């Protein structure tokens, strides 16, 4: 029952400040050290700094000038602050607890440092072509186009249809992300049973559910 969770802004403009909250449970902050680590998209891990149980701080020299860590032992919360943010600070930010290694991590919060503006996605259902050769199995799809920043959460039937799914990483084109997802079921299961794509873009408070309906009369 050792848990950590990062709460961050998601989208920061360059030259502005960043604040991340690490809410922990199952252990007392006064007795364990919490570390901060970041991972630029597609790159390796960088140790950012730490805060000891007693309250002393050690920061990474590279960012020491802009990095600041505090905490509140009572509320089980550790805080990260970054000044003079820049585009090369875009990364996934993790907090982790150290005891004989970084054994427990948060799931990480993605921070995109960019002046671009939040845009909600358009969600499109991708039903099979007409004709096709409907036999043995069928493949449906979901296209999520024109959104910023990452991430987006795509599920199929609220997460129940997780088998035979391929959700592809988003691609950035003209400062807007595009993402897609395929799901393969047996011919007998669709369109008999309903299949729906569930898309959430939290940075824009968007949550869309697009049902995949045949293109013709069936």
């Amino acid at each position: 029952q050792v848990q950590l969770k990062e709460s961050g802004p998601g989208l920061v403009a360059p030259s502005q400040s960043l604040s991340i909250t690490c809410t922990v449970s199952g252990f007392s902050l006064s007795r364990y050290s919490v570390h901060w680590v970041r991972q630029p998209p597609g790159k390796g891990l960088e140790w950012l700094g730490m805060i000891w149980g007693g309250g002393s701080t050690d920061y990474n020299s590279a960012l020491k000038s802009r990095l600041s860590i505090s905490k509140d032992n009572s509320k089980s919360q550790v805080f990260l602050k970054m000044n003079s943010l820049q585009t090369d600070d875009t990364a996934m930010y993790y907090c982790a607890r150290n005891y004989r290694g970084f054994a427990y991590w948060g799931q990480g919060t993605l921070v995109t440092v960019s002046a671009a503006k939040t845009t909600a996605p358009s969600v499109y259902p991708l039903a099979p072509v007409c004709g096709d050769t409907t036999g043995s199995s069928v493949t449906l799809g979901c296209l999520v186009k024109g959104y910023f920043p990452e991430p987006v959460t795509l599920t199929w039937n609220s997460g129940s249809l997780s088998s035979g799914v391929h959700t592809f990483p988003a691609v950035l084109q003209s400062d807007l992300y595009t993402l897609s997802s395929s799901v393969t079921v047996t011919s007998s299961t669709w369109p008999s049973q309903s299949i729906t794509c569930n898309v959430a873009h939290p940075a824009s408070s968007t949550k869309v559910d697009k049902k995949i309906e045949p293109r013709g009369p069936t």
């Binding site: 891990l45 990480g108 004709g131 296209l143 592809f168 293109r215």
Partner: protein, 214 residues
């Protein structure tokens, strides 16, 4: 700072073969070495503590050795679920430093793609956009090429491709290719085609449809 050099940066092994990953520290770090496995979309997972102590619940196939400057991480019988990025970490002196990481992929038997082509949705056509999507699913090896053709003529601009990470269960890859046009340019042609050239076939796999024919 203490620098940690991790090698190799990339690695590909057949199912069952051994994996060897090495981390050299610029200074003597005693045994303050830990090893991690990171799957896509997840944080790193601690596998080894104190250079050699396997964390409970980690398969015995995993092991590590070293004291001082030379540390080695080993997988005896690599299984499909072992695909991931692996990292070492020195915790001897500040600032803590990670190795550069090792990307592990699994060699397996050839698998031809399952290709599916999807015309633009009616909802997208109303907004003025037109995306033709081609899914190329569960193939191996990762190398593959998609050629879009409109009325038999190759189209290059406006294509966005994306690959999944190697699958943890069957060790295959999948890809999405999306050709984005204007509703106008889309309605100006008839046959749309995505051709996949893969090691699994000399004649490319073709999926196509006609705009007005259905």
């Amino acid at each position: 700072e203490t620098t940690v050099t991790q090698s190799p940066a990339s690695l590909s092994v057949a199912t069952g073969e051994k994996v060897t990953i090495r981390c050299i520290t610029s200074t003597d770090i005693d045994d303050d070495m830990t090893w991690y496995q990171q799957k896509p979309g997840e944080p790193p997972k601690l596998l080894i503590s104190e250079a050699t102590t396997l964390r409970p619940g980690v398969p015995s196939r995993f092991s590590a050795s070293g004291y001082g400057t030379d540390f080695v991480f080993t997988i005896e019988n690599t299984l499909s679920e072992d695909v991931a990025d692996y990292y070492c970490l020195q915790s001897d002196n500040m600032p803590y430093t990670f190795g550069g990481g090792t990307k592990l992929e699994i060699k397996r038997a050839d698998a031809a793609p399952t290709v599916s082509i999807f015309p633009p949705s009616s909802e997208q056509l109303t907004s003025g956009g037109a995306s033709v999507v081609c899914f190329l699913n569960n193939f191996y090896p990762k190398d593959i090429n998609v050629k879009w053709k409109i009325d038999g003529s190759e189209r290059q601009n406006g294509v966005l491709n994306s690959w999944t990470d190697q699958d943890s269960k069957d060790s295959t890859y999948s890809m999405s290719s999306t050709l984005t046009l204007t509703k106008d340019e889309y309605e100006r042609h008839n046959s749309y085609t995505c051709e996949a050239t893969h090691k699994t076939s000399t004649s490319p796999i073709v999926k196509s449809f006609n705009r007005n024919e259905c």
